[PDB]
Amino acid sequence: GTTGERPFSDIITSVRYWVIHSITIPALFIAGWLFVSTGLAYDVFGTPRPDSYYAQEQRSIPLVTDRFEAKQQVETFLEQLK
Amino acid sequence: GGRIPLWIVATVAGMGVIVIVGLFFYGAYAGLGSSL
Amino acid sequence: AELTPEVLTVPLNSEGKTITLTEKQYLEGKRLFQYACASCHVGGITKTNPSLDLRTETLALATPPRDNIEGLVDYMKNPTTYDGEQEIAEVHPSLRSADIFPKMRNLTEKDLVAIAGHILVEPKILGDKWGGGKVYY
Amino acid sequence: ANLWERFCNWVTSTDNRLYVGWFGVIMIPTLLAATICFVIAFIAAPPVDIDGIREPVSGSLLYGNNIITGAVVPSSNAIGLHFYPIWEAASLDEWLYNGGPYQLIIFHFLLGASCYMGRQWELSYRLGMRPWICVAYSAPLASAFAVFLIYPIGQGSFSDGMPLGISGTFNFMIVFQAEHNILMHPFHQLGVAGVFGGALFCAMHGSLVTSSLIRETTETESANYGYKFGQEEETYNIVAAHGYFGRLIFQYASFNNSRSLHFFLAAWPVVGVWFTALGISTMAFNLNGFNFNHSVIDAKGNVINTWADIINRANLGMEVMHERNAHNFPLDLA
Amino acid sequence: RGWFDILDDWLKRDRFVFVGWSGILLFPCAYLALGGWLTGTTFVTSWYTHGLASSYLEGCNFLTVAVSTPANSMGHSLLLLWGPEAQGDFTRWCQLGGLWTFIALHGAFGLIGFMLRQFEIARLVGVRPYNAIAFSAPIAVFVSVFLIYPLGQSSWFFAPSFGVAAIFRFLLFFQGFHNWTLNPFHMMGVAGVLGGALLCAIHGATVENTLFQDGEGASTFRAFNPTQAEETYSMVTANRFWSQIFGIAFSNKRWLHFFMLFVPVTGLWMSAIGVVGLALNLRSYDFISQEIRAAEDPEFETFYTKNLLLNEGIRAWMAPQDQPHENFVFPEEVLPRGNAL
Amino acid sequence: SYPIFTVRWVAVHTLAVPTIFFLGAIAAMQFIQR
Amino acid sequence: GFAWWAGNARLINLSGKLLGAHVAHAGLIVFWAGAMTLFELAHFIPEKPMYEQGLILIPHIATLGWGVGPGGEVVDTFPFFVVGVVHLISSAVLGFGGVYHAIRGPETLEEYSSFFGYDWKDKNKMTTILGFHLIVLGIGALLLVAKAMFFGGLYDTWAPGGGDVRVITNPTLDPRVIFGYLLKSPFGGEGWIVSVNNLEDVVGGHIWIGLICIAGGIWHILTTPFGWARRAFIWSGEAYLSYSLGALSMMGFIATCFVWFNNTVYPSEFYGPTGPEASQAQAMTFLIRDQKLGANVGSAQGPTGLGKYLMRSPTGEIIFGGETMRFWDFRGPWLEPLRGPNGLDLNKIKNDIQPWQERRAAEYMTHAPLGSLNSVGGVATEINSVNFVSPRSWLATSHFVLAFFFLVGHLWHAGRARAAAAGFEKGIDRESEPVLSMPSLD
Numbered sequence A: 001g002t003t004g005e006r007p008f009s010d011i012i013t014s015v016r017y018w019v020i021h022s023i024t025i026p027a028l029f030i031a032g033w034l035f036v037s038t039g040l041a042y043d044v045f046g047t048p049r050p051d052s053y054y055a056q057e058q059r060s061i062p063l064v065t066d067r068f069e070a071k072q073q074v075e076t077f078l079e080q081l082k
Numbered sequence B: 001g002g003r004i005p006l007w008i009v010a011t012v013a014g015m016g017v018i019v020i021v022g023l024f025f026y027g028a029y030a031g032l033g034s035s036l
Numbered sequence C: 001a002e003l004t005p006e007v008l009t010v011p012l013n014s015e016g017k018t019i020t021l022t023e024k025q026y027l028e029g030k031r032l033f034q035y036a037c038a039s040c041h042v043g044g045i046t047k048t049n050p051s052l053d054l055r056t057e058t059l060a061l062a063t064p065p066r067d068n069i070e071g072l073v074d075y076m077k078n079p080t081t082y083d084g085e086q087e088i089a090e091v092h093p094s095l096r097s098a099d100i101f102p103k104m105r106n107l108t109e110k111d112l113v114a115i116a117g118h119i120l121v122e123p124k125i126l127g128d129k130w131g132g133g134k135v136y137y
Numbered sequence D: 001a002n003l004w005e006r007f008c009n010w011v012t013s014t015d016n017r018l019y020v021g022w023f024g025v026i027m028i029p030t031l032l033a034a035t036i037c038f039v040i041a042f043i044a045a046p047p048v049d050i051d052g053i054r055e056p057v058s059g060s061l062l063y064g065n066n067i068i069t070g071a072v073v074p075s076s077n078a079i080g081l082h083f084y085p086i087w088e089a090a091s092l093d094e095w096l097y098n099g100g101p102y103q104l105i106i107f108h109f110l111l112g113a114s115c116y117m118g119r120q121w122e123l124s125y126r127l128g129m130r131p132w133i134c135v136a137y138s139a140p141l142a143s144a145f146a147v148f149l150i151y152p153i154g155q156g157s158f159s160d161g162m163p164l165g166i167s168g169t170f171n172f173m174i175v176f177q178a179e180h181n182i183l184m185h186p187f188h189q190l191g192v193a194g195v196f197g198g199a200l201f202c203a204m205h206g207s208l209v210t211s212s213l214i215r216e217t218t219e220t221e222s223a224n225y226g227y228k229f230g231q232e233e234e235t236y237n238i239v240a241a242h243g244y245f246g247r248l249i250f251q252y253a254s255f256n257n258s259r260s261l262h263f264f265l266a267a268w269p270v271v272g273v274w275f276t277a278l279g280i281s282t283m284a285f286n287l288n289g290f291n292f293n294h295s296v297i298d299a300k301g302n303v304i305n306t307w308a309d310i311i312n313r314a315n316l317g318m319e320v321m322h323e324r325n326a327h328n329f330p331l332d333l334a
Numbered sequence E: 001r002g003w004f005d006i007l008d009d010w011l012k013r014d015r016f017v018f019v020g021w022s023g024i025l026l027f028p029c030a031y032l033a034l035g036g037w038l039t040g041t042t043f044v045t046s047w048y049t050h051g052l053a054s055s056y057l058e059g060c061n062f063l064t065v066a067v068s069t070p071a072n073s074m075g076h077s078l079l080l081l082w083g084p085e086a087q088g089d090f091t092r093w094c095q096l097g098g099l100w101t102f103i104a105l106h107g108a109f110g111l112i113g114f115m116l117r118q119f120e121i122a123r124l125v126g127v128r129p130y131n132a133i134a135f136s137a138p139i140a141v142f143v144s145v146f147l148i149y150p151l152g153q154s155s156w157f158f159a160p161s162f163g164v165a166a167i168f169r170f171l172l173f174f175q176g177f178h179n180w181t182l183n184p185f186h187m188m189g190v191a192g193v194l195g196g197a198l199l200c201a202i203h204g205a206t207v208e209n210t211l212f213q214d215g216e217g218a219s220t221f222r223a224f225n226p227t228q229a230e231e232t233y234s235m236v237t238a239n240r241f242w243s244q245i246f247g248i249a250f251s252n253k254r255w256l257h258f259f260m261l262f263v264p265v266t267g268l269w270m271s272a273i274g275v276v277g278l279a280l281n282l283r284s285y286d287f288i289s290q291e292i293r294a295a296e297d298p299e300f301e302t303f304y305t306k307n308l309l310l311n312e313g314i315r316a317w318m319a320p321q322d323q324p325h326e327n328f329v330f331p332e333e334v335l336p337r338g339n340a341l
Numbered sequence F: 001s002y003p004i005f006t007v008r009w010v011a012v013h014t015l016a017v018p019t020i021f022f023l024g025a026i027a028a029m030q031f032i033q034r
Numbered sequence G: 001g002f003a004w005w006a007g008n009a010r011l012i013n014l015s016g017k018l019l020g021a022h023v024a025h026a027g028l029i030v031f032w033a034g035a036m037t038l039f040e041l042a043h044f045i046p047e048k049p050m051y052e053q054g055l056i057l058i059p060h061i062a063t064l065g066w067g068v069g070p071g072g073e074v075v076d077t078f079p080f081f082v083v084g085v086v087h088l089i090s091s092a093v094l095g096f097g098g099v100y101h102a103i104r105g106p107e108t109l110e111e112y113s114s115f116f117g118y119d120w121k122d123k124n125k126m127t128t129i130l131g132f133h134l135i136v137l138g139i140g141a142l143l144l145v146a147k148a149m150f151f152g153g154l155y156d157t158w159a160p161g162g163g164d165v166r167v168i169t170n171p172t173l174d175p176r177v178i179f180g181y182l183l184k185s186p187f188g189g190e191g192w193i194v195s196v197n198n199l200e201d202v203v204g205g206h207i208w209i210g211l212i213c214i215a216g217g218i219w220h221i222l223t224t225p226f227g228w229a230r231r232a233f234i235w236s237g238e239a240y241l242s243y244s245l246g247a248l249s250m251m252g253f254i255a256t257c258f259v260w261f262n263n264t265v266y267p268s269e270f271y272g273p274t275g276p277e278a279s280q281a282q283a284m285t286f287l288i289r290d291q292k293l294g295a296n297v298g299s300a301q302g303p304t305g306l307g308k309y310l311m312r313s314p315t316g317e318i319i320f321g322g323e324t325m326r327f328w329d330f331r332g333p334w335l336e337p338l339r340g341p342n343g344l345d346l347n348k349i350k351n352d353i354q355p356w357q358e359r360r361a362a363e364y365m366t367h368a369p370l371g372s373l374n375s376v377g378g379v380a381t382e383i384n385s386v387n388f389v390s391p392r393s394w395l396a397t398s399h400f401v402l403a404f405f406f407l408v409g410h411l412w413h414a415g416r417a418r419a420a421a422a423g424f425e426k427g428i429d430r431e432s433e434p435v436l437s438m439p440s441l442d
């Protein structure tokens, strides 16, 4: 009824487990927070910030309309916000 | 072994879940996505 | 795009003087509008009389013009029909009728400006959606 | 040997090919009345003025319908929730125009179906069984009550109950979405999980038992002949089933107790369907699905549409068109 | 005793999570499909492909986030990261919809790996492979809906986007444009899913209420041993109850459990066939005899004609925002509307 | 004698590590204002 | 040998611990009553209608006459505070006794005293406990009569002048009226007991119910069940529980319809308008608007050929047109001034509509009980802005849900009580399977 690995309930009630993980779990949580709070997540993924969906007096969507010039269309849309 | 009683581990983890979920529901009324 | 002073700049009176609201005033106006007005005027229409909306071009053609802070502040005190011919305080919320419309009781003079300011700003932001009804939802 | 005692012995007899019982005494006339009226109306009823606006809808085969478009049409909005038996009409012609048969069918049917649930308890008691098969059936029964009775009460009219027809069903669920956004309501979401999960677990349990049948036949025979009705030994190896399914996922995600397994099979779709029946029953009082229309706006205040806004455009299209002649004022408040 | 057999040994070790030869295909593809969906719903927009916000970062909740389809202008491009559209730029690849094909394609190969896993474990354990066979129904549904259907249309844009509300929009699109509820292949699918759920509940309930008393406790679960040879419930009493309640009942335990496999599997296969038709707009949209009569006879009205009016409102009211690449401008005066509303 | 690092160990952290990372990022997002 | 998840069934035969469970649980009920009232009061803002503020308990107190004056305006919130505090305080005492009897007190009562101890199978003792509680309930029904007639009265939405607190001096005692309600059909235009539309019938009904309950309590103290009743029932703790579960389910369904349709003991001033009311108010609103513009509402033919504003009901009464034709059975104090013998009176409509009636219809039309789960007001296609779901929707839906599940609990516990009484609740005896001794069906 077992395949040789250490039981989970034995692991998570053990002191050594919680010695390591009271650091690793908050560290990963803080790291993810800073990914957003530093604004890095916006730049990695290309996600618009609340002020960069539209140019100031614009109400047209910057919809991609060409297949092979698509990359350049996005880039041109973005310069209309600089 | 069995130092930390499992009923205590479950209580604390459970409250950690409640806190994060509660934070997510708070954010439905503030900031982005709140309609304000 | 963002809430800049140019969008926050609206007419003060008929003579053409302008006033520039703060972002705080805009947000306060939106809150007070939801508190006291939105039940009939959500999104700039009028549920109990759809023929009359809060679009700026509509308010400009009202008698006393209402497309300016003064005209709107006066309306919240002594509302009239669209042609100016009769006072309608007893069927429309106003300070003059805060006894029969209790939500008007605790509105101070600066609240009135915030509420008027919101009504004039919003069509600049939402365009056709303000006062357009479900066609533009 | 008394005449009443012998009748009581026949009613509750476990020897009738079909059990009658005291619940059967109410069920049999009510279901026969509902069935006979349904068949006749479906084939032959004239058009019914469902929305009270003197615009009759043709439901029956003889008036130009096929099996897919035919319906018994709900009773007139002019009647609302008023009781409309035959003897309240000036004539059968009047009763037919106004949708009388719908009321007769659904009232007799809800009674007979309720007694069907009671009859399930009753025979279980005469046979010495455990009693809760009727609790499983309460989930479909509650659903039928929701669409034929509860939702009418909340909206104020049997004309808004579900039509007794295939396309009439579709009309009902399209209008239900435009007015309640039922897709965005969590009790319908749980109903889908009850029904998707139910079909899943049906296929799983069927495939796992079938996978582990003990060899009892030749390749020229149906393996089904390896089981004889009323044999005492099991016909499959649950240990082999568990040994496979536990390795497919991991060991503790698989059942090796057949009683807990079958209880799980019972409870998942039953509970899911209770919730979706409660969804219809609480949207009867206009507590509707989540509304995230224009919930996302940018720094200036432009609306940033989400998929919820696209749904709303679809809902709007259904709203403006349904019952295109029935509304004179701008808000559809029921 | 070469390297191949050594590796075979290690892949087939009995461990907490069985690996197997199929694990080499299954595990990477399952993890990337899942990770793609979590990454995109947390961080990635749909602004440039759809004009929609769609991530937690943008303000969306669990019901509204999605990994959305590429823009219509991409056609059926594979949208590979290194391909001519994104040209190796990860950021542009996200903005152009590349996570959608990433998830659909890795998802497709993970499904294959999972079915191979069912075959692989069944062979090592010694059982018949009917669980794998039943899993062909989920695969048929996935490939017909996410692959075949958009491949018959103009582009991936019209496939389902991976999100809760995005799938709801897919449902309503199919009503207004395809009249999918009228399609007998969907109706057969409905009967298979609903009939599956019924069989699931009725079989579970029957077993639990014909149990043998094999212990003294009021909790009846303890009175079962997985190695007992005896049936734990009475087929004879179950058959009598249902024969007298419903008129017919199961009498053969093997047929019953095969029927439980057959019903939902067959239903899903049927619905898949109808979606293949809709790939080509081969809809069951109309009944011609109804339309001929209704066009000539303005007093003739059915629930069929009522529903088409509802489809026509759906199309006109959602199309401009739902298909933004078409630049549909519908002035207020052309929108179909009943009175007052 | 229990091993520490197993195939199971990898499967567990392959899911749990980015899960907590993602939960931290989503928490921060609740305090973003427009 | 119940499992932990059925662990409260271990209390069936431990009368002392089961007493603690009941009394502790009663402390929970009173605690929530106390705490919820203080919460509502802390959030209450008097210049907003109660129904714009998500209040469900303050409306119950206001209906009893406390805190309000003419038109339903709140004059004094101190009565609300008192009701909350006293409930909250009382919950400590019930909490104290509950935990004592559940943890420290005697596990079983029948040793400590032959008065408080009981056996479920003792039909004499069971009807005695029932009789005591019937008397308690009878006193409870007369407290409401006392408040209405001797201690300040009740809020009366029908009082001339827009509603007001009114002392009830002539409660209805005619049993043809009181029991006439119990024989009205539950269908539209009748509405069974939900149709009660005046305080005199309400107070008189409670005099009758108080007396009936006290008389019935004394009956059951002094008698034991007759043989016909002894052969018809199961006599066990779980059976008694199952019977009460059925009664609570029935009662919850009734309460659902009461708050949805009745605007007399659920005044719309406090609870917001009913569904029918709000839909009638919209037709009133545009009738008023269009007639001010010159429209002749009586002769205006709508698109279908039916009147655009006014039409006839199936029995001829003049009623509002449009879809609200279904709601013509609605009666409310803002509308009744316009009714003559034949329904809505065209001459009153032309000449006698007052500004307060225009205000009230516009208010109720824009506060129809429609809203989303996240409290966006209006139809499902409305945009965000108005934070509102009517108290009537909250109360109708919650109690339908509770009523439904208690019907399921009735089925569960009734079937089990039967099977446990006959001895096959744990399964079929392999050596004595009934079907194996029956002839085959074919």
Ligand code: CLA
Pocket: E024, E025, E028, E029, E032, E078, E079, E080, E081, E082, E098, E101, E102, E103, E105, E106, E109
């Ligand atoms: C079994 C695992 C597996 C499978 C089946 C896939 C399958 C796929 N991936 Mg995924 N991927 C995987 C693991 C896997 N991936 C892993 C582990 C990662 C992390 C690095 C990724 C990261 C990833 C990304 C980032 C992308 C894909 C993409 C794709 C698709 C296109 C791949 C392609 O064209 O292959 C081409 C390569 C081959 C077919 C292999 C060729 C091997 C031949 C037989 C030998 C050739 C000889 C060799 C070249 C000689 C070199 C000599 C040298 C000295 C010069 C396809 C659905 C793309 C996608 O989803 O598009 C939307 C994409 O953009 N994958």
Ligand code: CLA
Pocket: G003, G004, G005, G006, G007, G008, G010, G011, G017, G018, G020, G021, G022, G024, G025, G092, G095, G096, G099, G102, G103
């Ligand atoms: C309204 C809810 C409610 C109530 C009143 C009870 C009451 C009871 N249960 Mg039940 N139970 C409930 C819910 C409830 N249960 C639920 C939801 C479950 C499922 C998890 C169970 C599962 C369960 C099992 C499995 C068993 C019981 C048993 C019992 C009884 C003895 C418990 C005991 O000795 O604990 C001892 C516990 C302690 C000493 C811990 C301290 C608990 C105290 C009371 C907390 C009080 C805090 C409060 C703030 C005090 C205020 C002080 C101030 C007012 C003075 C008791 C009458 C047992 C029984 O029948 O005994 C034969 C038993 O075996 N119950």
Ligand code: CLA
Pocket: G019, G023, G093, G094, G096, G097, G098, G100, G101, G105, G106, G109, G112, G113, G116
């Ligand atoms: C349903 C409620 C209920 C019932 C049936 C019992 C029954 C019992 N209790 Mg328990 N008890 C209860 C509630 C209840 N108690 C509460 C609420 C508390 C907390 C204050 C206690 C605290 C308590 C203690 C501390 C002890 C008992 C004991 C006893 C036993 C002897 C009682 C006796 O001789 O009193 C004789 C009769 C009287 C003293 C007359 C009391 C008159 C009351 C208080 C006034 C009337 C109240 C009114 C009707 C309603 C409240 C008003 C409110 C609405 C504002 C008996 C089995 C004793 C025991 O078991 O010994 C081992 C014991 O030591 N009880």
Ligand code: CLA
Pocket: G127, G130, G134, G182, G183, G212, G213, G214, G215, G216, G217, G219, G220, G223, G224, G225, G226, G229
């Ligand atoms: C909580 C309330 C309550 C409860 C649980 C009981 C319980 C009991 N009573 Mg008591 N009873 C009560 C209040 C209560 N009583 C009151 C207040 C009075 C004074 C009027 C009486 C007067 C009384 C008498 C005179 C008798 C009982 C008897 C009984 C026993 C048999 C009951 C029975 O078979 O009914 C089942 C009901 C029937 C068989 C007939 C049903 C008839 C109704 C009207 C059907 C209608 C239901 C319908 C669907 C809903 C619409 C209602 C309609 C009226 C509009 C049982 C122990 C009997 C006994 O043994 O006494 C010692 C007996 O003869 N009771």
Ligand code: CLA
Pocket: G004, G005, G006, G007, G008, G009, G241, G245, G405, G406, G407, G408, G409, G410, G412, G413, G416
């Ligand atoms: C007056 C009400 C009442 C009373 C006193 C009882 C009493 C009893 N029931 Mg019954 N029951 C009731 C109503 C009631 N029931 C209702 C309404 C239903 C239908 C749903 C049932 C269905 C039912 C079943 C199916 C069974 C019982 C059983 C039992 C016994 C054991 C109960 C136990 O230990 O539970 C322990 C308590 C728990 C395990 C807690 C359950 C947790 C609930 C379901 C979730 C609550 C969450 C809530 C909805 C809000 C969520 C928000 C979130 C923050 C939590 C006991 C005699 C058992 C039995 O037959 O014993 C003889 C049994 O198997 N009951």
Ligand SMILES: CC1=C(/C=C/C(C)=C/C=C/C(C)=C/C=C/C=C(C)/C=C/C=C(C)/C=C/C2=C(C)CCCC2(C)C)C(C)(C)CCC1
Pocket: B017, B021, E031, E032, E034, E035, E036, E037, E038, E039, F014, F015, F018, F019, F020, F022, F023
């Ligand atoms: C895409 C991509 C990739 C990949 C990535 C990955 C793989 C990712 C992963 C990711 C992940 C892996 C993530 C995760 C996350 C998670 C989450 C976010 C979770 C959450 C959850 C929750 C929230 C829950 C809660 C709850 C509830 C609600 C109830 C019950 C209880 C519980 C607690 C469960 C790469 C690099 C290759 C490159 C290309 C691109």
Ligand SMILES: CC1=C(/C=C/C(C)=C/C=C/C(C)=C/C=C/C=C(C)/C=C/C=C(C)/C=C/C2=C(C)CCCC2(C)C)C(C)(C)CCC1
Pocket: G021, G024, G025, G027, G028, G031, G085, G088, G089, G091, G092, G094, G095, G096, G098, G099, G102
């Ligand atoms: C048995 C049991 C149980 C149960 C229990 C119970 C349920 C209990 C109860 C209890 C209770 C029920 C309690 C109560 C309490 C109360 C109190 C203690 C109160 C206090 C009060 C106060 C102090 C107040 C104050 C105030 C005032 C006076 C004024 C205003 C303000 C304030 C509010 C602050 C359980 C399940 C857990 C477990 C198992 C066993």
Ligand SMILES: CC1=C(/C=C/C(C)=C/C=C/C(C)=C/C=C/C=C(C)/C=C/C=C(C)/C=C/C2=C(C)CCCC2(C)C)C(C)(C)CCC1
Pocket: G177, G178, G179, G181, G182, G193, G196, G201, G202, G203, G204, G205, G206, G208, G209, G232
């Ligand atoms: C307060 C009030 C009032 C009054 C009321 C009254 C006067 C009532 C009464 C009520 C009553 C007086 C009721 C009764 C009930 C009854 C019932 C509910 C019954 C039940 C039954 C049963 C359940 C049975 C069963 C059975 C059978 C059938 C067979 C054999 C077996 C058994 C026994 C099981 C009014 C409306 C004026 C107004 C408002 C307020």
Ligand SMILES: [Cl-]
Pocket: D171, D175, D321, D322, D323, D324, E306
């Ligand atoms: Cl329609």
Ligand SMILES: [Cl-]
Pocket: D326, D327, D328, D329, G321, G322, G323, G324
């Ligand atoms: Cl209307």
Ligand SMILES: [Fe+2]
Pocket: D205, D209, D262, E203, E257
């Ligand atoms: Fe089975």
